[PDB]
Amino acid sequence: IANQFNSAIGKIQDSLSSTASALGKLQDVVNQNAQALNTLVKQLSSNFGAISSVLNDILSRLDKVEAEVQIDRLITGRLQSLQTYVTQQLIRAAEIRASANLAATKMSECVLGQSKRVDFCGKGYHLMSFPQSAPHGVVFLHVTYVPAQEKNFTTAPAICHDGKAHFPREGVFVSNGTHWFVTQRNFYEPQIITTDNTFVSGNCDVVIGIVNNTVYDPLQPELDSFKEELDKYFKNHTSP
Amino acid sequence: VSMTKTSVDCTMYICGDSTECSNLLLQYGSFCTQLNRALTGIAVEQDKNTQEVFAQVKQIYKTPPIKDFGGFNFSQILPDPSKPSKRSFIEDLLFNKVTLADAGFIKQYGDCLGDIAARDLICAQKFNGLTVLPPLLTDEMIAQYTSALLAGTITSGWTFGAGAALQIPFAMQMAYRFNGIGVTQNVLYENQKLIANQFNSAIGKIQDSLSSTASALGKLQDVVNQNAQALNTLVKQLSSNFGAISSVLNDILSRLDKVEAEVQIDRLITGRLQSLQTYVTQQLIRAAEIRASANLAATKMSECVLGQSKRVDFCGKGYHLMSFPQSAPHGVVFLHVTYV
Amino acid sequence: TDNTFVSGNCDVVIGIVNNTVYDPLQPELDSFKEELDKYFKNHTSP
Amino acid sequence: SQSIIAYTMSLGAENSVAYSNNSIAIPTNFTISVTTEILP
Ligand SMILES: *[C@@H]1O[C@H](CO)[C@@H](O[C@@H]2O[C@H](CO)[C@@H](O[C@H]3O[C@H](CO)[C@@H](O)[C@H](O)[C@@H]3O)[C@H](O)[C@H]2NC(C)=O)[C@H](O)[C@H]1NC(C)=O
Ligand SMILES: *[C@@H]1O[C@H](CO[C@@H]2O[C@@H](C)[C@@H](O)[C@@H](O)[C@@H]2O)[C@@H](O[C@@H]2O[C@H](CO)[C@@H](O)[C@H](O)[C@H]2NC(C)=O)[C@H](O)[C@H]1NC(C)=O
Ligand SMILES: *[C@@H]1O[C@H](CO)[C@@H](O[C@@H]2O[C@H](CO)[C@@H](O)[C@H](O)[C@H]2NC(C)=O)[C@H](O)[C@H]1NC(C)=O
Ligand SMILES: *[C@@H]1O[C@H](CO)[C@@H](O[C@@H]2O[C@H](CO)[C@@H](O)[C@H](O)[C@H]2NC(C)=O)[C@H](O)[C@H]1NC(C)=O
Ligand SMILES: *[C@@H]1O[C@H](CO)[C@@H](O[C@@H]2O[C@H](CO)[C@@H](O)[C@H](O)[C@H]2NC(C)=O)[C@H](O)[C@H]1NC(C)=O
Ligand SMILES: *[C@@H]1O[C@H](CO)[C@@H](O[C@@H]2O[C@H](CO)[C@@H](O)[C@H](O)[C@H]2NC(C)=O)[C@H](O)[C@H]1NC(C)=O
Ligand SMILES: *[C@@H]1O[C@H](CO)[C@@H](O[C@@H]2O[C@H](CO)[C@@H](O)[C@H](O)[C@H]2NC(C)=O)[C@H](O)[C@H]1NC(C)=O
Ligand SMILES: *[C@@H]1O[C@H](CO)[C@@H](O)[C@H](O)[C@H]1NC(C)=O
Ligand SMILES: *[C@@H]1O[C@H](CO)[C@@H](O)[C@H](O)[C@H]1NC(C)=O
Ligand SMILES: *[C@@H]1O[C@H](CO)[C@@H](O)[C@H](O)[C@H]1NC(C)=O
Ligand SMILES: *[C@@H]1O[C@H](CO)[C@@H](O)[C@H](O)[C@H]1NC(C)=O
Fold this sequence. Notes:
This is part of a larger assembly, with four copies of chain A. Helices cover 44% and strands 21% of the residues of chain A. Chain A has five helices and ten strands. The first copy, chain A, is rod-shaped, with a radius of gyration of 37 Å. At the A-B interface, helix 4, strand 2, strand 5 and strand 9 of A face helix 3, helix 7, helix 8 and helix 13 of B. Strand 2 (59-62) of chain B pairs parallel with strand 1 of chain D, so a sheet runs across the interface. Chain C: This is Spike protein S2'.
């Protein structure tokens, strides 16, 4: 498990070292804010129906009564340019606030905790996450347990042993083909079916698809060995 | 989950077929590019939203042909192979309760001119540069992702989200789902006929409700109605004077010379340009509402469908067992199964 | 004794009531006391 | 010999799940994976 985490962090270095487009979510946010300032600067070059885009070239050629008919066009067009930019930025800022509030929720729930929320902290069963800073953003390194080498088993909802029906306490029943076992749901570690692994409810007849097996009572040979302790004490005391 | 992808030919909206007006419009500079870039940013993300919601498996799970699911009868929500689009029965109800306008899918004038030019608002939108693009995924591709998610859920439980799909019997999955809600797993196995009959009856009430009421998909028809009303408002703004002697660009250029027309046409450019700016501002604000709905729907897909949710009243009111996705026009529908 | 866990005594728990927690090992040993006793009663014979 | 091609996009690898009313698959082993997620 340590070797797999150490190897998987080594792939984070190799990936970030290799590919150009991975941090595209952050670079796209730089490129929008830079393109919007560059579009706002290019819009100063527009005439808006005045004799020039250059404000001082109007004032170098026209007197007050002819100039204000030109300057007002440039005011009207350039104030429309700023209102457009500030509208685009006010809309944009809500995309980044919704992403900051998600990154703050991933910090609280993936870094300061462990998340039972499926696929919130990467595709797998979440173990933990580590924050890493990035320009105008955050990177989360989500660590997940992923189940890998699955083999098919025969299974049953319940076991019959004593007219009673038995169910897993935690886990599921499985057969290899000849013997029945109980195991944890997310990793094959098979165990003998016992009265400690299983709880009882009702008789066989009500459960659909139930099967016959023998449920070990680990108290029984611990008392039956005590019967051989009893019975040898009985045979010896026949002698005197 | 998404909305119609508009793109607007800003020079043909403001200056339909005119050189004089196009040469005046250039004096506002970047605006027509800034509008088309902004609308392209909205159109590009409708496919992001639809991909984030539905494309949560990179593997198209197929159901077994035999339906040994222990009494639970998914035939009502699984694909119907008989249909020309392989959508399920409940999806074929959802696809009829929302009435789309222009899915982008090809015009050949024979239908846009003559008998079909008249009443049809969509030809009036198009003839003034307002164009609607198709989604990236067709309604058949969305049904194949929804089919994979459902065929995964019933055969594999939550395991197809966390890793490779692991089969488990459906009545054995429901025992895990009962332990999830703190109920003991025998409370399924000792009542499985009742739990299957209650599920089958509850899906019977979904079919009946969607077949009976005229208003259930109101959250989706109100998106189609907002897009269609916004394009119709944008079309009507072409009929206004803005203080020019006429609304009609050719009625200025066939009546006034190369210097009287400049004073009139610049009014129509000012008011038409503000009409496009107002439209794209509304559509950018709107697109943030649909985004927020799509990011919620991708979360309900991740946590209710690919999982089981211990989050109270997130996946319908009750103790959550499981959910089935169904697609709809510009949206998604979750059938949330709950123990009450 | 399998359904429940023990912690401390009656004086601290506000509203605790009297009952008798079954020990499922106990009658399984009391029936072993009768398995023991019948062998002693037989062993009075030889 | 390179050219632009056009095609109906594949949605993913097709997989019929090996379901039966008594067959379960259980993982005999696991992979620990680390995945980077980037947020503005
Ligand atoms: C299903 O799992 C069973 C448990 O692993 C397995 O049975 C076990 O088989 C091994 C041999 O592979 C036996 O090992 C013993 O064999 C004899 C017993 O007299 C001894 O000489 C050996 O030293 C060794 O101790 C186990 O005794 C046996 N366990 C049980 C409970 O019988 C099955 O073979 C597996 N079946 C399939 C279909 O794979
Ligand atoms: C897991 O099992 C399924 C089928 O269950 C088994 O199928 C038999 C071959 C046999 O082992 C029985 O005891 C079980 O009931 C496998 O599905 C098969 O996949 C192959 C290709 O690999 C395909 O040709 C077969 O048609 C499939 N059989 C069925 C019934 O669907 C599946 O591949 C197994 N998975 C692994 C990892 O072994
Ligand atoms: C599980 O075991 C029980 C008991 O051994 C089986 O039930 C018996 O079935 C036979 C054949 O019909 C009858 O003659 C017995 O009287 C039955 N006894 C009981 C307690 O039911 C049952 O058939 C077995 N089930 C399986 C799947 O093997
Ligand atoms: C699952 O439910 C469907 C109905 O929702 C059942 O399909 C119907 O079956 C009857 C009897 O064969 C036919 O007369 C109907 O026309 C079928 N309806 C449809 C829409 O196909 C189906 O049989 C049920 N499955 C099980 C296992 O009971
Ligand atoms: C594109 O135009 C062609 C006509 O050139 C259309 O083909 C016609 O389709 C109808 C309906 O199937 C037939 O009745 C005609 O005889 C076809 N004519 C020809 C020449 O093929 C075709 O349907 C159009 N495609 C689209 C998407 O509009
Ligand atoms: C629960 O049982 C205990 C023990 O039987 C009770 O405590 C006894 O109370 C009586 C009356 O006050 C005393 O005379 C005894 O000496 C107490 N026994 C002990 C061991 O302290 C207790 O009152 C009972 N509680 C209830 C609610 O019935
Ligand atoms: C579980 O899977 C791991 C791989 O993730 C297995 O580890 C490899 O074991 C083989 C020998 O069987 C070595 O050649 C590899 O170099 C090992 N890899 C690592 C990362 O150490 C592991 O043996 C498997 N365990 C079981 C019980 O199947
Ligand atoms: C399981 O399905 C088989 C057919 O594949 C059938 O013979 C058997 O009775 C079913 N058993 C249960 C418990 O559903
Ligand atoms: C039999 O009991 C006597 C005590 O009376 C003891 O000393 C002796 O070791 C016992 N022998 C056996 C074989 O149990
Ligand atoms: C509960 O309330 C009753 C009055 O209704 C009171 O007599 C009793 O002592 C209370 N018991 C506890 C455990 O609070
Ligand atoms: C007593 O033990 C003998 C064997 O020594 C046995 O035959 C007999 O049935 C037993 N009787 C009782 C009452 O235990």
